[PDB]
Amino acid sequence: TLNGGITDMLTELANFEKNVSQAIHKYNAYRKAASVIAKYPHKIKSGAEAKKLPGVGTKIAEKIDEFLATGKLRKLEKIRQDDTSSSINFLTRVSGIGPSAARKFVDEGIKTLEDLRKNEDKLNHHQRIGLKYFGDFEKRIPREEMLQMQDIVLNEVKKVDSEYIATVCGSFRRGAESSGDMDVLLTHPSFTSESTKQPKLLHQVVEQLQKVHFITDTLSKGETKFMGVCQLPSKNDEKEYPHRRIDIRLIPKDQYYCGVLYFTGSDIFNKNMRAHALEKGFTINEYTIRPLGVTGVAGEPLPVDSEKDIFDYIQWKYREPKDRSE
DNA sequence: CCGACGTCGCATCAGC
DNA sequence: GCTGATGCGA
DNA sequence: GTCGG
Ligand SMILES: Nc1ccn([C@H]2C[C@H](O)[C@@H](COP(=O)(O)NP(=O)(O)OP(=O)(O)O)O2)c(=O)n1
Ligand SMILES: [Mn+2]
Ligand SMILES: [Mn+2]
Ligand code: NA
Ligand code: NA
Secondary structure: OOOOOHHHHHHHHHHHHHHOOHHHHHHHHHHHHHHHHHHOOOOOOHHHHHHHHOOHHHHHHHHHHHHHHHOHHHHHHHHHHHHHHHHHHHOOOOOOOOOOHHHHHHHOOOOOOOHHHHHHHHHOHHHHHHHHHHHHOOOOEEEHHHHHHHHHHHHHHHHHHOOOOEEEEEEHHOOOEEEEOOEEEOOOEEEOOEEOOOOOOOHHHHHHHHHHEEEEEEEEEEEEEEEEEEOOOOOOOOOOOEEEEEEEEEHHHHHHHHHHHHOOOHHHHHHHHHHHHHHHHHOOOOOEEEEEOOOOOOOOOOOOOOOHHHHHHHHHHHHHHHHHOO
8 A cells, every 4th residue: 555645636636537527537547547557566755656657647757746745735725615516426326426517406505415405306317316325335345254145145146046147256256355346257058148948047146145134225126237235144133234236247158268357347447448458459358259340340350268368369368357457 | 538338128219 | 208418326 | 538559
């Protein structure tokens, strides 16, 4: 955590540009700068030293010099003191409320937690559930709890159909001692890139999880992706566990490796790897890796038999999940 | 300089 | 209702 | 905000 002060500053600047300025590429630029500094193994002593890193340019180098010298950034100081930015920034912390809805709400004089509770009628379903569990969703999940959750999910899925395979991905698969949520990759032999031989494959799994009162709420739900809320069972006289975010992703079984690569992350690792893939003349999604044709159009899917095969195509040394925490 | 910046799913809305 | 764009999110 | 070509 050598440069925590610097990475915190950049992250706050990223959130500002995303939530307030609605400038997603500035948000990404700061996300990237924060990431490359985060894994830089020296305590940074100047902006010039920082500017050597890819993604760190002049402006950020200048900001790092201010931060090192003073321990603050006047730019951030002002943003903090500002009514509207602070309100918009806060509202986006509710799941389902983004930059657009947040700014629209603030315009209407809705800018506090109290205001949201008072105006629940103005929320779409996602946002209402997000407000309901605002407190809970602030809390992180200890890996021990994640292990309990894994046991329930894997066993309940087994009970539906023994041919399901459920794989917990995200920060958990990367070995994090705590997680923001739980991500579950799901496969079933009936669903491949070639055919879907059974309907409601994801539905049946969700339904079962609701039945045992594990899944408590639904944010969104389609044929291949579920976003919702779950909770561990507590014992007698035990205070209940916090409600947790969970999302589930049904991937065609023959495309498991691209799927698990995607869902393991991190988000920035995925961006770095896909950017590199493009440089090498391939494109990668959660389904396939395709070569790019000489006019830039994606071609047929390439054979994939392991995560490492995808790494091999773009000439990257294989990296274990725990080294993908970028 | 300066266009281009990872790829896609589900909810909602605009237009017909 | 459908098609495509936008919002929010993985 | 950054950068490659
Ligand atoms: N922008 C994003 C967000 C997520 N993802 C993929 C990579 C993530 O590791 C995986 C799960 O998303 P996530 O749950 O938001 N983040 P993740 O599990 O990495 O870390 P946590 O904050 O949940 O601990 O989805 C992505 O490819 N692009
Ligand atoms: Mn996660
Ligand atoms: Mn998730
Ligand atoms: Na740089
Ligand atoms: Na939000």
